[PDB]
Design a protein around this ligand. Sequence first.
Ligand SMILES: Cc1nc2[nH]c(C(C)C)cc(=O)n2n1
Ligand SMILES: Cc1nc2[nH]c(C(C)C)cc(=O)n2n1
Length: 185
Amino acid sequence: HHHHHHMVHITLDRNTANSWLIISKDRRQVRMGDTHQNVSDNKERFSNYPMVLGAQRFSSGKMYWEVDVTQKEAWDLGVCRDSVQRKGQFSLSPENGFWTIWLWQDSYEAGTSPQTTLHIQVPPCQIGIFVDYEAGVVSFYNITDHGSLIYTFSECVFAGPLRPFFNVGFNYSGGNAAPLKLCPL
Ligand SMILES: Cc1nc2[nH]c(C(C)C)cc(=O)n2n1
Ligand SMILES: Cc1nc2[nH]c(C(C)C)cc(=O)n2n1
């Protein structure tokens, strides 16, 4: 790809975070805490899963950012509608307002309904996310493998403003404590 030059500075929105998440001072890293993080509840917080949104809202143009996933066992990344459900159980799908990929149990999958198997030869340590609002495209790139394409959602029906979307995953195994980190431009 050659999408780096639509690079945007993403920061995480504390107010949307699940109450067990710990967001760094610079709002560029997030990890799972070992307990509730002593915050009040609010209607924006994802209740059931270790999810958080970016602060930025996009309704036009081309946007690109990169996320470090080094030594994690489980995570979800992509974009979602500003109006996605926050409370209770739900699946990650375009019908529910999400355009995501994930790692789970040694397999990478795209969040279609039902999910799509991804074919990645070089396990990624950093993921690039490209959104073309006007074209209705969300694409995922393997920065560890010279920027190779992972997956493209096309004909997307955004139906509203978009926000960067993150899930650090649970840490039942003790092997998934590592943070998600927004990489420098
Ligand atoms: C399922 C569900 N969880 C909540 N939590 C709250 C606040 C206490 C944040 C309002 C609300 O309507 N719901 N609905
Ligand atoms: C949408 C979604 N569904 C789940 N389910 C679980 C476990 C209960 C399997 C963790 C998680 O992060 N998510 N995110």
